[PDB]
C-alpha cells in the first residue's frame, strides 16, 4: 500500500491530496460549466463540458453551475464529473489502489451519504472508504479533543460541540447561511452603487471582490457613521474589463449578514448566537471548556476582524466571569483537509475503513452503522 | 390645497395626471430629440430640442434618444427637459403648489433617487414629494394586499412579492429584459426577411409593428411547425412610406424572448421562472396565496396570450395541487399610475410626504430613510 | 437704407430687381456678343461688345456666347460685363448702397462662389451680400417648409429635399440636362426634316421654337403612333426670314429627353427617377410629406403637360397607397426670384448678410462658413 | 476527388480559387455590363453582355451595374452570369466535380442563402456546398480562435466577436457603410473642385482615385488646418483622357466617413464605436481578450493609417488600463479567401458539406439548419 486519499468536497472548492501531507495538492473550484453560445470554429479542441480551473478561465462563454448546494449534492452527473477530474486529471492516481477519505456536513440527508458510497465502489472501485464529519476533522487540525467548532464554508455553517473525544449530537446546530449567500447579498447591494452583476460569470467576480475588500466591522452602528466621512472607508477594485468600482460601506456590510441574518430575510440567529445556543444546550459542567476553545474553520471565517467580533459578542452573552477565547489558526481555510490528513494517517484508524468486501454483503446502507 | 400630481416616469412613456382621476391626462413618450441635418429656412419656428409628442411627429430629421435606460436616468439634462414639458406644456400647472408623487423601479441606484429629490425641490420647488415603488402601486390598482407583481415595462421587468401589507425585499427579482429589448431583437430578425430598420426613427416603427402584430405563442415548438403552412400566420403592415411588409413567424417569436432570454444572449431565466424563483424564496406558508394572485402590469404584459402562457408554464413548475391564477386587468398598462392616483388620495398618507422643510435640514439623503 | 437687390443670375436669363416686389424689373438673356464681320461705317455707334437685350436684337452679325455653362461661370470677364449692364444700364442703381442677394445651384464648385464674392466687394463695393441656393428660394415662393424641389432651368436640373426647415444635403441630386441641352437636341432632330440651324444666331431661334411649339407627351409610345396620321400633330412656325417650317413629331420628342436622357447619350435617369431616387435617399418617416409636395420651378418646367406626366410617372414608381401631388404654380418661371424677394425682406435675415467689414478680415473664404 | 473550390463572392470583387492555395487564381470585379449605344459594325464579335475584366476594359460604351448591393444579391440573372464566368471562363473547371465553398455576410436575408443553394445544385450540379460567414473565415487566416473581426468590404461593414471557438451572435453589428459609399461620397466632394464624375464608367475611376490617393487622417481637425498650407497635402492623378486633377483635402476626408458617418447622412456610429459597442455587448470576462485581438480584414481597411487611428480612438473609449492591439496583416484584402482555403482543406470539415443527396430530400431550407 502506498497511501490514502483525502478528498474534501466542499460547496465552493474541492480540496484533495494525499494523507500525511501538510497542504492539498489539488485546490480548484467545484464548478461544472457547459458552453451556451453557438460554436463556429470547426475542431480545435472544444469539449462538451469544462470542470474546475478550466471552466474558471473560460467562464465568459459558459453557464457555470455548482453541483453542491448547501452541502446536498443535487446534480450527481456533475459530481461524478468533478471526482473524475479530481483523481485522473488533477491528482493523476489510480482510484483502484488508494482508499478515499470523504467529508460531509452534519445533519445531512441519508441518501447523500449512501450515494457517495455507491459511486466510490461501483464506479471508481476504491479498496476502502470512510465518510467523516467536517467539524470533527477541524479539531484534529488544531490537535485537540475539546472545543466547539464553528465551521463556516461556502454552503453551510454548523456548530459541533465536542468534549473530550465525545460528540454531543443534540447540540449540533446547522445554519445554511454561508459564503454563497454572502455573495448573493453582495450582488444585491452593489446594485445600489449602480453596478449590475447578474449572470453567472459575474458571480465569480463578486466572489473575488468579497475575498479582497470585505472585512467585519467591530461595531456595525459606528462604521455606518464613518460612512458619512467616506475617506478611508472606500476602496477600489479593477474588474476584468478594466473598469473600476468604488465600493464603500458595502465592504463591512455584507459580512454583517453572518451576525444579522435578517438582512437576507432569514428568521434565524447569527453565528454568535448559534454558538451560544449550542453551548447552552450542553451539560453545565462542560460549558467552561467550550468557552475557552472556540475553533473557527472554513473560508468564510477568513475575514479581517471576525475573531475580534466573535470574542466581543459572545462575551456580551456569556456570564462575565467566564473567559472566551476564539481560536483562529492562520491555515484555517484548509483545516478540514489538514485534520483529514491526520486522521487517515493514524495507526488506530485502519479498521474503521469500509472495505469493498464489507460493502458487497451489506449494500449502500453500511455507511450509517459504520461511520457515524 | 387643490390636489396632488402623480408623475409616472417610465422608460418608454411618461404617464402624468392628478390624483383622484381614473386615467392620466398626459401620456407621451419619453423621447428628447435634437435635429441632425443642416437647417436652411430662416426663422419660422425651429427649436433647439423637441420633446415627446412633438419629437414623435418630426422624427425623420431628429436624433431621438431616451434619457432613461433600464430604469436608471442617465441624461439628467434631458430628464429635466421632459419634466419641464410635462408640468408646463402638458399639464399646465404651477409646480410650486402641487405635491408630486414619483415612481421608480426597485433595486435601483441610490443616486437615482437622490437626484430626483434634488431636482423636484431645487428646480421646481414643489411643496412635497414622495418616491414610490412601482410594483407596490400596481397592487393598489387591483385593490389588494396580497400578490406577487410581474411589472414588465419598457426598461425593466421585476417581481415584487407582497403578502398582507408586508413586502419581502429579499425575494425581489429584477430582470433588465423589457420592451426596448424586444424591439431591438425584432429589428434583428426583420433583417432576415430583408427589411433593414437601422436608424432611430425606424426604431419607433418597429416598436409600432410590435404593438400591433406580435402575440405570444402558447406552445412555441408548434407555431414553428405552423410556419410550414404560413397561411393564417403571416400578416401585413403598412409602413409610413407606403411600403408593406409580410411578417411571418416573427410575430410570435420576439415575445418568446420574455420566456427564453437566450435569444438575446442573456444567461438569466424567463419571466415564468423569475416568478417561480421569487415565490420559492418566500416563506412556505405564504406560497399558496402568491400562486393565487399573480398581478401582471406594465405594457409589455399587453400581448395577446401572455396570461394564457404564464398560467400554463408556472403550472408546469408549481406542484400540481396548487391553483395558479394569473390576474390581468384590461387597464393594466396604466396600473402603476392608477395605484398612484389611489395612494396619493388616501387620507392616511398626508404625513408620508417629504416636505420642503424636512428636505432643507436633511439634504438629499432624506429620501432613503423616509420613503423605503 | 432704401432696399436690397435680388440678382438671380441664371444660365439663360438674368432676373433682377428689388426686394419686396412681386416681379423682376430686369429680365434679359445672359448673352455677351462680339461682332464677327468687318465693320465699314465710320463712327455711328459701334461698341466693342453687346450684352443682353441689345445683343439679342443685333444677333445676325454677332458671335453670341454664354458666360455661364451648366451653372459654372466660365468667362469671368463677360460675367462682370453682365453685372455691369444689370446694375447700371438696366436697374439704374448705385451698387455701393444696396445689399445684393445672389443665387447659385447646389453641388457647385467652391471657386465659383468665392469669385462671385470677390467681384461684388472688390469691384462693385456693395455694403453686404449673401449667396443663396436656388431650390431653397423656390420654396419660399410657394410659402412652405416641406417639399422636394425640382428646379430645372437652362443649365442644371437639381432636386433638393427640404423637410420642415431642414435641408437634407445627402439627397441633393444634380443633373446637368436642362433647357440648353433640349435646344441642342432639337437642332439635331430638325435636321431630319431638312432644316439646318447651325450658327449661334439660329440657336436663339430653335430656343424660340421650343418655347412655343413643344409639349410633353403623356404617353410617348402612343404619340409616335399618332405621327402616322399627322393631322393635328404638325404645327407651323414663321422664321425671321419669312420661311415656314412644319414641325411634326419633334414637338413632343425633345422634352422626352427630360424623361429619357439616353436620347442625348447620357447614362443617367430622367427627372421622374431622379425625384424618386432622391426621396428614397431620405428618411422613411418623411417620404410621405415629400410625395405630397413636389414643387416644380424654373423655365424648363413650363411645357404644357409636364405636371401631368410627373404625376403619372412617379405614381408608377411610388407605392400605390401614397398620394402624389405635383405642385406647379403658374408663375413658376420666376419663383427663384420670388422667393429671393421674400427672403431679403424678412426681418429675421439682416444678420445673415456678409458685410464689407466681415469680408475684409476673412478673405473670400468667408462665404462657405457663413452662407451654407 | 481532386480538391474543393472557394468562391468568395463580394460586392466589389469575386475572389475565387482552389482550397489549399495561398492566393486566389481569379480576382475580377463583380460587374455585368450591357452595351448602351447603337452598334453599327456587322459581326466582329459583339456579345450581349460583358462580365468582369472584359467589362472593365470596354466600360466606356457599357451600362455597368453590380448584381450585389450591400451584400444582398438583387439581380439573380446577373449573378448566375458571374458564376458562369467564374467557373468556366476564369477557373476552367467542371462544376459537377468540385465542392464549392461560398461566403456571405452575417445578418443577411434567409432567401439570399436559399437562392445561392438552389443555384449551385439545380444549375451547376455541384457535389457539395457550404455557406460560411465571412468574419469567421477572416480569423482562420490569422490562425486564431479569439478576436473581434472588423470586416469592412465594398458592400457591408460588420463586427463579429468570436471568443475561443464560440461566436456571440447577439453582439454582431452590421453597418452598411462600405467602400461603395466612400466612392459615392468622393464623387460628391470632387464636384467642389470642379470635376464632375457622373456616369457609371467614371464611378470606376473615382474608385481608382480612392485606392491610390486617399489615406486616413490621424487627427481630422488638424489635417483640415494643414489645408491652409496645401503644399504636401495636394497630389495629382492622371485620368484616362490625359487630364490631371489636383485633389487636396479630399484625400483624407472621404475615409473620415468611416469614422463620422454623418457626412453621408447616416445616424449610426463610426467603425471605432461599432467595435466598442460590440465588445460592450459581450460578457465582462472576455472583454480583455477582445481588446487584444482586433482583426481587420477586407479592402476598405487598406487605407494608409487606419490601424493607427483605430488604435488611437478605441483607446479613448476603452478604460485606460486595457491594452488595445489592432491587428492588420498586410494580406488582409484576401483574408476571407485565405481562411476559406484553410477551412476547406481541414480534415475535420468533410462531414459539414451539404451534399446533393442531403439537399434533395430537404429542399432549399437545409442550409439554415446545417451551416449556421
Ligand atoms: N479570504 C477570504 N475572505 C473571505 N471569504 C473568503 C475568503 N476566501 C474564501 N472565502 C469564501 O469561502 C468560500 C469557500 O471557503 P471554503 O471553506 O473552502 O468552502 P468549502 O469549505 O469548500 N464549502 P463547504 O466545506 O461545503 O462548507 C468562498 O466561496 C468564499 O465565499
Ligand atoms: N399593445 C402592446 N402590446 C405589446 N407591447 C406593448 C403594447 N403597448 C405597449 N407595448 C410595449 O410596452 C411599453 C409600454 O410602456 P410602459 O409599460 O409604460 O413602460 P414603462 O412603464 O413606461 N417603463 P417602466 O415603468 O420603467 O418599466 C412600450 O414601450 C412598448 O414597448
Ligand atoms: N414657355 C417655355 N416652355 C418651355 N421652355 C421654356 C419656356 N420659357 C423658357 N424656357 C426654357 O427655359 C430656359 C430659361 O429658364 P430659366 O429657368 O429662367 O433659366 P434660368 O433659371 O435663368 N437658369 P437657372 O438659374 O439655372 O435655373 C430657356 O432658355 C428655355 O430653354
Ligand atoms: N488600396 C486600397 N485602399 C483603399 N480602399 C481600397 C483599396 N483597394 C480596394 N479598396 C476598396 O475595397 C473594395 C473592395 O474590397 P473587398 O473587400 O475585396 O471587396 P469585397 O470584400 O469583395 N466586398 P464584400 O466582401 O461584399 O464586402 C473596393 O471597391 C475599394 O472601394
Ligand atoms: Mg469546508
Ligand atoms: Mg411602468
Ligand atoms: Mg434659375
Ligand atoms: Mg469581403
Short mmCIF file of C-alpha atoms in Angstrom, two decimals, chain D:
data_model
loop_
_atom_site.label_atom_id
_atom_site.label_comp_id
_atom_site.label_asym_id
_atom_site.label_seq_id
_atom_site.Cartn_x
_atom_site.Cartn_y
_atom_site.Cartn_z
CA UNK D 1 -11.54 13.72 -55.61
CA UNK D 2 -9.16 16.46 -56.74
CA UNK D 3 -9.88 19.46 -54.48
CA UNK D 4 -12.56 21.96 -53.47
CA UNK D 5 -13.49 25.42 -54.77
CA UNK D 6 -13.55 28.55 -52.62
CA UNK D 7 -15.69 31.23 -54.29
CA UNK D 8 -15.64 34.43 -52.22
CA UNK D 9 -18.38 36.47 -53.86
CA UNK D 10 -18.09 40.05 -52.67
CA UNK D 11 -19.90 43.23 -53.51
CA UNK D 12 -16.89 44.57 -55.39
CA UNK D 13 -14.64 41.67 -56.31
CA UNK D 14 -15.10 37.98 -56.97
CA UNK D 15 -12.21 36.13 -55.36
CA UNK D 16 -12.04 32.53 -56.49
CA UNK D 17 -9.59 29.68 -56.49
CA UNK D 18 -8.88 26.26 -55.08
CA UNK D 19 -8.53 25.12 -51.50
CA UNK D 20 -5.02 24.69 -50.18
CA UNK D 21 -3.65 27.64 -52.14
CA UNK D 22 -2.25 30.85 -50.68
CA UNK D 23 -3.76 33.28 -53.21
CA UNK D 24 -6.89 33.26 -55.38
CA UNK D 25 -6.38 32.46 -59.05
CA UNK D 26 -9.38 34.59 -60.05
CA UNK D 27 -9.70 38.21 -58.92
CA UNK D 28 -12.02 40.22 -61.15
CA UNK D 29 -14.70 42.80 -60.34
CA UNK D 30 -18.32 41.80 -59.85
CA UNK D 31 -19.63 43.87 -62.76
CA UNK D 32 -22.05 42.85 -65.51
CA UNK D 33 -22.21 45.42 -68.30
CA UNK D 34 -24.74 45.78 -71.12
CA UNK D 35 -23.91 47.98 -74.12
CA UNK D 36 -25.97 51.14 -74.38
CA UNK D 37 -25.09 52.71 -77.73
CA UNK D 38 -26.20 51.81 -81.24
CA UNK D 39 -23.85 49.21 -82.68
CA UNK D 40 -23.00 49.57 -86.34
CA UNK D 41 -20.15 47.19 -87.24
CA UNK D 42 -21.68 43.96 -88.52
CA UNK D 43 -20.42 40.83 -86.80
CA UNK D 44 -16.82 41.02 -85.49
CA UNK D 45 -17.55 39.71 -82.01
CA UNK D 46 -20.26 41.64 -80.17
CA UNK D 47 -21.74 39.82 -77.20
CA UNK D 48 -24.99 40.66 -75.45
CA UNK D 49 -23.24 41.08 -72.09
CA UNK D 50 -19.75 41.65 -70.71
CA UNK D 51 -18.71 40.36 -67.29
CA UNK D 52 -15.80 41.23 -65.05
CA UNK D 53 -12.40 42.06 -66.51
CA UNK D 54 -13.84 42.35 -70.01
CA UNK D 55 -16.49 44.87 -69.00
CA UNK D 56 -13.83 46.78 -67.08
CA UNK D 57 -11.87 47.25 -70.30
CA UNK D 58 -14.83 48.11 -72.57
CA UNK D 59 -16.54 50.27 -69.96
CA UNK D 60 -16.87 53.46 -72.00
CA UNK D 61 -19.79 52.05 -74.01
CA UNK D 62 -21.42 49.93 -71.30
CA UNK D 63 -24.04 50.44 -68.60
CA UNK D 64 -22.15 48.80 -65.77
CA UNK D 65 -24.06 47.54 -62.78
CA UNK D 66 -23.39 45.45 -59.71
CA UNK D 67 -25.65 42.46 -59.00
CA UNK D 68 -24.71 42.58 -55.30
CA UNK D 69 -25.70 45.66 -53.35
CA UNK D 70 -24.93 45.74 -49.63
CA UNK D 71 -24.40 42.01 -49.52
CA UNK D 72 -27.89 41.22 -50.79
CA UNK D 73 -27.91 39.77 -54.31
CA UNK D 74 -30.61 41.72 -56.11
CA UNK D 75 -30.18 40.63 -59.74
CA UNK D 76 -30.06 36.79 -59.76
CA UNK D 77 -29.85 36.68 -63.56
CA UNK D 78 -26.58 38.61 -63.47
CA UNK D 79 -25.24 36.68 -60.50
CA UNK D 80 -25.71 33.39 -62.35
CA UNK D 81 -23.82 35.11 -65.19
CA UNK D 82 -20.81 35.92 -62.98
CA UNK D 83 -20.66 32.39 -61.54
CA UNK D 84 -20.81 31.03 -65.08
CA UNK D 85 -17.92 33.33 -65.96
CA UNK D 86 -16.07 32.41 -62.77
CA UNK D 87 -16.06 28.64 -63.19
CA UNK D 88 -15.87 28.16 -66.95
CA UNK D 89 -14.19 31.24 -68.39
CA UNK D 90 -11.89 32.01 -65.47
CA UNK D 91 -11.06 28.90 -63.44
CA UNK D 92 -11.75 26.45 -66.31
CA UNK D 93 -13.23 23.71 -64.15
CA UNK D 94 -16.17 21.36 -64.29
CA UNK D 95 -18.66 22.36 -61.55
CA UNK D 96 -20.02 18.80 -61.28
CA UNK D 97 -16.79 17.53 -59.70
CA UNK D 98 -15.65 20.11 -57.16
CA UNK D 99 -17.43 21.06 -53.92
CA UNK D 100 -17.91 24.80 -53.65
CA UNK D 101 -17.33 26.90 -50.53
CA UNK D 102 -19.37 30.11 -50.57
CA UNK D 103 -19.19 33.12 -48.28
CA UNK D 104 -21.74 35.72 -47.26
CA UNK D 105 -22.20 38.46 -44.71
CA UNK D 106 -23.83 37.92 -41.31
CA UNK D 107 -27.32 39.23 -40.50
CA UNK D 108 -28.39 38.61 -44.08
CA UNK D 109 -31.77 37.62 -45.58
CA UNK D 110 -32.87 33.99 -45.42
CA UNK D 111 -33.82 34.00 -49.10
CA UNK D 112 -30.34 35.16 -50.07
CA UNK D 113 -28.80 31.94 -48.76
CA UNK D 114 -31.54 29.62 -50.02
CA UNK D 115 -31.22 31.01 -53.52
CA UNK D 116 -27.45 30.51 -53.60
CA UNK D 117 -28.10 26.91 -52.57
CA UNK D 118 -30.76 26.42 -55.23
CA UNK D 119 -28.46 27.72 -57.98
CA UNK D 120 -25.42 25.66 -57.02
CA UNK D 121 -27.39 22.40 -57.20
CA UNK D 122 -30.12 22.90 -59.78
CA UNK D 123 -27.96 24.80 -62.29
CA UNK D 124 -24.32 23.86 -61.71
CA UNK D 125 -24.98 20.47 -60.02
CA UNK D 126 -22.04 20.60 -57.61
CA UNK D 127 -21.37 17.53 -55.41
CA UNK D 128 -21.46 19.53 -52.19
CA UNK D 129 -21.52 23.07 -50.89
CA UNK D 130 -21.24 25.08 -47.70
CA UNK D 131 -22.03 28.72 -46.95
CA UNK D 132 -19.69 30.28 -44.41
CA UNK D 133 -19.74 33.61 -42.61
CA UNK D 134 -17.00 35.95 -43.78
CA UNK D 135 -15.83 37.18 -40.40
CA UNK D 136 -15.43 33.61 -39.20
CA UNK D 137 -13.16 32.96 -42.18
CA UNK D 138 -11.19 36.15 -41.54
CA UNK D 139 -9.98 34.58 -38.30
CA UNK D 140 -8.72 31.30 -39.74
CA UNK D 141 -6.46 33.43 -41.93
CA UNK D 142 -4.74 34.90 -38.89
CA UNK D 143 -4.77 31.38 -37.39
CA UNK D 144 -6.69 32.19 -34.23
CA UNK D 145 -9.68 31.42 -32.06
CA UNK D 146 -10.19 34.69 -30.17
CA UNK D 147 -10.89 38.13 -31.54
CA UNK D 148 -13.42 40.62 -32.80
CA UNK D 149 -13.28 40.95 -36.58
CA UNK D 150 -13.81 44.27 -38.34
CA UNK D 151 -14.57 43.08 -41.87
CA UNK D 152 -15.16 46.17 -43.99
CA UNK D 153 -15.54 45.42 -47.67
CA UNK D 154 -17.34 47.06 -50.57
CA UNK D 155 -20.93 46.49 -49.50
CA UNK D 156 -21.06 45.91 -45.77
CA UNK D 157 -19.02 46.55 -42.62
CA UNK D 158 -19.63 44.11 -39.80
CA UNK D 159 -18.16 43.22 -36.42
CA UNK D 160 -18.33 39.61 -35.24
CA UNK D 161 -16.95 38.90 -31.75
CA UNK D 162 -15.53 35.39 -31.55
CA UNK D 163 -14.19 34.04 -28.26
CA UNK D 164 -12.46 30.65 -28.02
CA UNK D 165 -14.26 28.97 -30.89
CA UNK D 166 -17.67 30.30 -29.85
CA UNK D 167 -19.39 33.07 -31.76
CA UNK D 168 -21.59 35.55 -29.90
CA UNK D 169 -24.46 36.21 -32.33
CA UNK D 170 -26.14 38.86 -30.18
CA UNK D 171 -23.13 41.19 -30.43
CA UNK D 172 -22.80 41.04 -34.23
CA UNK D 173 -23.09 44.58 -35.58
CA UNK D 174 -23.80 45.18 -39.25
CA UNK D 175 -23.16 48.61 -40.75
CA UNK D 176 -23.97 49.16 -44.43
CA UNK D 177 -21.33 51.87 -44.88
CA UNK D 178 -18.55 50.46 -47.01
CA UNK D 179 -16.26 51.23 -49.92
CA UNK D 180 -19.06 51.80 -52.41
CA UNK D 181 -20.44 54.51 -50.13
CA UNK D 182 -17.00 56.07 -49.87
CA UNK D 183 -16.77 56.31 -53.64
CA UNK D 184 -20.19 57.95 -53.87
CA UNK D 185 -19.19 60.49 -51.24
CA UNK D 186 -15.96 61.07 -53.13
CA UNK D 187 -17.83 61.79 -56.37
CA UNK D 188 -19.84 64.37 -54.43
CA UNK D 189 -16.83 66.19 -52.94
CA UNK D 190 -14.77 66.12 -56.11
CA UNK D 191 -17.54 68.28 -57.57
CA UNK D 192 -16.48 71.15 -55.32
CA UNK D 193 -13.09 71.16 -57.04
CA UNK D 194 -14.97 71.35 -60.33
CA UNK D 195 -14.56 67.81 -61.60
CA UNK D 196 -17.89 66.17 -62.38
CA UNK D 197 -17.81 62.37 -62.46
CA UNK D 198 -21.40 61.24 -63.04
CA UNK D 199 -21.89 58.23 -65.29
CA UNK D 200 -21.11 54.68 -64.24
CA UNK D 201 -17.86 54.45 -66.19
CA UNK D 202 -16.49 57.34 -64.12
CA UNK D 203 -17.59 55.55 -60.95
CA UNK D 204 -14.79 53.08 -61.72
CA UNK D 205 -12.33 55.97 -61.99
CA UNK D 206 -13.18 57.59 -58.66
CA UNK D 207 -12.83 54.11 -57.17
CA UNK D 208 -9.31 54.08 -58.59
CA UNK D 209 -8.61 57.59 -57.27
CA UNK D 210 -9.63 56.37 -53.82
CA UNK D 211 -7.37 53.31 -53.90
CA UNK D 212 -4.31 55.44 -54.72
CA UNK D 213 -4.56 58.86 -53.12
CA UNK D 214 -6.80 58.54 -50.06
CA UNK D 215 -5.48 57.95 -46.55
CA UNK D 216 -6.85 58.24 -43.02
CA UNK D 217 -6.03 61.34 -41.01
CA UNK D 218 -4.81 60.60 -37.51
CA UNK D 219 -6.47 63.79 -36.24
CA UNK D 220 -9.09 65.16 -38.61
CA UNK D 221 -9.28 68.67 -37.15
CA UNK D 222 -5.53 69.17 -37.62
CA UNK D 223 -5.26 67.98 -41.22
CA UNK D 224 -8.00 70.48 -42.05
CA UNK D 225 -5.68 73.11 -40.60
CA UNK D 226 -2.92 71.75 -42.86
CA UNK D 227 -5.21 72.52 -45.83
CA UNK D 228 -4.36 76.18 -45.22
CA UNK D 229 -0.79 75.48 -46.38
CA UNK D 230 -1.73 72.95 -49.06
CA UNK D 231 1.82 72.07 -50.06
CA UNK D 232 2.45 68.42 -49.16
CA UNK D 233 -1.28 67.74 -48.93
CA UNK D 234 -2.25 68.02 -52.59
CA UNK D 235 -1.47 65.21 -55.03
CA UNK D 236 -2.19 64.74 -58.72
CA UNK D 237 -3.80 61.95 -60.71
CA UNK D 238 -3.71 61.29 -64.45
CA UNK D 239 -7.18 60.45 -65.76
CA UNK D 240 -7.64 58.04 -68.71
CA UNK D 241 -8.23 61.01 -71.05
CA UNK D 242 -4.91 62.59 -70.12
CA UNK D 243 -6.30 65.25 -67.80
CA UNK D 244 -4.90 65.81 -64.33
CA UNK D 245 -6.80 66.60 -61.15
CA UNK D 246 -5.26 68.20 -58.06
CA UNK D 247 -7.10 66.57 -55.18
CA UNK D 248 -6.43 68.33 -51.90
CA UNK D 249 -8.14 67.80 -48.57
CA UNK D 250 -10.45 65.30 -50.28
CA UNK D 251 -7.71 62.70 -49.80
CA UNK D 252 -8.18 62.24 -46.07
CA UNK D 253 -11.75 63.46 -45.92
CA UNK D 254 -13.62 60.62 -47.54
CA UNK D 255 -12.21 57.85 -45.24
CA UNK D 256 -13.31 60.01 -42.30
CA UNK D 257 -16.83 58.89 -43.28
CA UNK D 258 -15.84 55.52 -41.80
CA UNK D 259 -15.34 57.36 -38.50
CA UNK D 260 -18.07 60.01 -38.86
CA UNK D 261 -20.95 58.54 -40.90
CA UNK D 262 -22.94 61.79 -40.56
CA UNK D 263 -21.05 63.05 -43.62
CA UNK D 264 -23.29 60.86 -45.76
CA UNK D 265 -26.34 61.44 -43.57
CA UNK D 266 -26.31 58.20 -41.58
CA UNK D 267 -27.42 58.44 -37.97
CA UNK D 268 -25.25 55.48 -36.92
CA UNK D 269 -21.79 55.49 -35.38
CA UNK D 270 -18.34 55.05 -36.86
CA UNK D 271 -16.33 51.87 -37.06
CA UNK D 272 -14.49 52.75 -33.85
CA UNK D 273 -17.79 52.95 -31.94
CA UNK D 274 -19.37 49.90 -33.54
CA UNK D 275 -16.34 47.92 -32.43
CA UNK D 276 -16.60 49.31 -28.90
CA UNK D 277 -20.36 48.85 -28.66
CA UNK D 278 -19.97 45.27 -29.85
CA UNK D 279 -17.36 44.49 -27.20
CA UNK D 280 -19.55 46.14 -24.56
CA UNK D 281 -22.38 43.77 -25.52
CA UNK D 282 -20.19 40.77 -24.71
CA UNK D 283 -19.56 39.19 -21.33
CA UNK D 284 -17.32 41.11 -18.95
CA UNK D 285 -14.82 38.25 -18.64
CA UNK D 286 -13.94 38.17 -22.35
CA UNK D 287 -13.60 41.90 -22.97
CA UNK D 288 -9.90 41.76 -22.12
CA UNK D 289 -9.24 39.21 -24.86
CA UNK D 290 -11.30 41.08 -27.44
CA UNK D 291 -9.34 44.28 -26.88
CA UNK D 292 -6.05 42.50 -27.52
CA UNK D 293 -7.28 40.92 -30.79
CA UNK D 294 -8.85 43.41 -33.24
CA UNK D 295 -8.54 41.66 -36.59
CA UNK D 296 -9.16 43.92 -39.54
CA UNK D 297 -9.96 42.47 -42.93
CA UNK D 298 -11.48 43.47 -46.24
CA UNK D 299 -10.24 46.03 -48.70
CA UNK D 300 -11.72 49.10 -47.05
CA UNK D 301 -9.28 48.51 -44.18
CA UNK D 302 -6.37 49.00 -46.61
CA UNK D 303 -6.02 52.77 -46.25
CA UNK D 304 -2.69 54.13 -45.03
CA UNK D 305 -3.18 54.92 -41.36
CA UNK D 306 -6.40 53.13 -40.48
CA UNK D 307 -4.75 50.82 -37.95
CA UNK D 308 -3.15 53.86 -36.32
CA UNK D 309 -6.48 55.63 -35.86
CA UNK D 310 -8.39 52.55 -34.69
CA UNK D 311 -5.71 52.05 -32.04
CA UNK D 312 -5.96 55.73 -31.15
CA UNK D 313 -9.72 56.03 -30.95
CA UNK D 314 -10.75 52.80 -29.24
CA UNK D 315 -8.18 53.72 -26.58
CA UNK D 316 -10.08 56.95 -25.97
CA UNK D 317 -13.21 54.83 -25.34
CA UNK D 318 -11.74 51.83 -23.51
CA UNK D 319 -10.59 52.11 -19.89
CA UNK D 320 -7.00 53.26 -19.68
CA UNK D 321 -5.57 50.07 -18.13
CA UNK D 322 -6.61 47.80 -21.03
CA UNK D 323 -4.21 47.41 -23.92
CA UNK D 324 -5.58 47.74 -27.45
CA UNK D 325 -3.88 45.92 -30.31
CA UNK D 326 -5.34 46.46 -33.78
CA UNK D 327 -4.02 43.58 -35.87
CA UNK D 328 -3.70 44.28 -39.58
CA UNK D 329 -1.99 41.65 -41.73
CA UNK D 330 -0.57 43.01 -44.99
CA UNK D 331 -2.53 40.36 -46.95
CA UNK D 332 -5.79 41.40 -45.24
CA UNK D 333 -7.57 42.10 -48.54
CA UNK D 334 -7.87 38.41 -49.40
CA UNK D 335 -8.12 37.07 -45.85
CA UNK D 336 -11.71 35.95 -46.28
CA UNK D 337 -10.45 33.78 -49.11
CA UNK D 338 -7.31 32.78 -47.18
CA UNK D 339 -9.39 31.45 -44.32
CA UNK D 340 -11.73 29.77 -46.76
CA UNK D 341 -8.75 27.97 -48.24
CA UNK D 342 -7.82 26.77 -44.75
CA UNK D 343 -11.32 25.69 -43.70
CA UNK D 344 -11.98 23.74 -46.89
CA UNK D 345 -8.70 21.84 -46.50
CA UNK D 346 -9.17 20.85 -42.86
CA UNK D 347 -9.66 17.15 -42.22
CA UNK D 348 -12.40 17.73 -39.62
CA UNK D 349 -14.62 19.51 -42.15
CA UNK D 350 -15.68 16.88 -44.73
CA UNK D 351 -18.86 15.99 -42.82
CA UNK D 352 -20.08 19.61 -42.79
CA UNK D 353 -20.72 19.81 -46.53
CA UNK D 354 -24.30 19.90 -47.80
CA UNK D 355 -24.22 17.05 -50.27
CA UNK D 356 -26.54 16.65 -53.25
CA UNK D 357 -28.36 13.75 -51.57
CA UNK D 358 -28.95 15.77 -48.39
CA UNK D 359 -30.32 18.64 -50.48
CA UNK D 360 -32.85 16.62 -52.48
CA UNK D 361 -34.76 15.19 -49.52
CA UNK D 362 -34.79 18.54 -47.69
CA UNK D 363 -35.32 21.32 -50.24
CA UNK D 364 -33.52 24.67 -50.10
CA UNK D 365 -34.22 25.15 -46.38
CA UNK D 366 -31.48 22.67 -45.43
CA UNK D 367 -28.89 25.46 -45.47
CA UNK D 368 -30.16 27.15 -42.30
CA UNK D 369 -30.13 24.09 -40.02
CA UNK D 370 -26.81 22.84 -41.39
CA UNK D 371 -24.47 25.81 -41.93
CA UNK D 372 -25.33 28.32 -39.21
#
